[PDB]
Amino acid sequence: ASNSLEIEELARFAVDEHNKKENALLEFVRVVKAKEQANLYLSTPIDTMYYLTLEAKDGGKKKLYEAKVWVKHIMYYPKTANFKELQEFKPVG
Amino acid sequence: ASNSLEIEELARFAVDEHNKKENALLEFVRVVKAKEQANLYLSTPIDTMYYLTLEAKDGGKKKLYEAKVWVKHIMYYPKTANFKELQEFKPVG
């Protein structure tokens, strides 16, 4: 589904993926602030961009990161699934 | 294999989109280098990111630019399509 707390594990997902691309080990505290943007077409959900504002411990003390995660919804062929892609992980204030 | 003509058009698009968004009048000349990064998941293409290094005339002087084009692929459902969007078009100085 969308929201609920899926937005938690998605931020969790983004962190990890900043730990490869930039080879770090941040630990995830919590999500602060999230924007969800979804596209439907004749009630088939296509696509969702999540602008997450995040809080993780950069090897030590809590900090503020702005992440952009894009999830592409695969509807029926060949099974319903999701494609998660981190595409911006840029600490802010 | 990257296809040169297809990239060349993708770059023509980059320059057109930049001219719209910033009331500039850059004149495309050629594409110099490109990196092309695509995802396929559950036997369907998902998206492709295009990093273009690009030569355009500016008031008549050929400078280099660098653009990021993202192409999202709609595959089967509501017709096969590709949605392009320009993100980041800056000179290479």
CA distance B59 to A74: 46
User: In the structure encoding, which two tokens stand for residue B44, read together?
Assistant: 């369907």
Give the domains, in start order, of chain B with CATH numbers. 1-93 (3.10.450.10)
CA distances from A4 to A35, A76, B16, B82 (A): 13, 23, 40, 31
Q: Do B74 and A44 touch (CB under 8 A)?
A: no
User: In the structure encoding, which two tokens stand for residue B90, read together?
Assistant: 């800056």
Amino acid at B63: K
Where are the alpha helices (H) located in chain A, listed in sequence order? 6-21
CA distance B75 to B83: 11
Could you check whether the bond before residue A78 is cis, i.e. omega within 30 degrees of 0?
Answer: yes
CA distance A31 to A7: 8
CA distances from B13 to A55, A57, B57, B67 (A): 37, 41, 15, 10
Task: Give the nearest partner residue to A72 out of B43, B46, B78, using CB atoms.
Answer: B46
A–B interface: beta-carbon pairs under 8 A: 29
Q: Please tell me the experimental approach by which this structure was elucidated.
A: X-ray
Contact B39, B48 (CB under 8 A): yes
- Among residues B62, B68, B61, the alpha carbon closest in space to that of B18 is found at B68
Strand partners of residue A71: A48, A84
Q: Do B42 and A75 touch (CB under 8 A)?
A: no
Chain A nearest-CA distance from B87, in A, is 12
